[PDB]
Amino acid sequence: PMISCDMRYGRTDEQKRALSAGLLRVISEATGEPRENIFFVIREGSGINFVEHGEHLPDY
Template identity: 35%
Template sequence: MPYVTIKMFEGRTDEQKKALCEKVTEAVIETTGASKESVVVFIEEMTKDNYSVAGKRLID
């Protein structure tokens, strides 16, 4: 059973997330031969106040 985790900043619409899940699922099916019912996609949305690069938060 393939599990895919996508981490991205919040702000996408439900329609965008739905399309992303559909396309990722199709890519997994195409490349691994897994059944559609076995593909699990997790979307983890992050806020910029909880993310930093080079010691600086992205909201600062």
């Protein structure tokens, strides 16, 4: 399985690994696929690059 997370820039390396452990776990259980077969990439950007509810987001 492949997973991708587009987030605003600013999260710490620690948060990102809590994210990957959290995401690999759930996808693994739901998929029956072992964690090692789950590819995961995080994509970062400026706050203005994200728009939620018609409004662009402020930098994180």
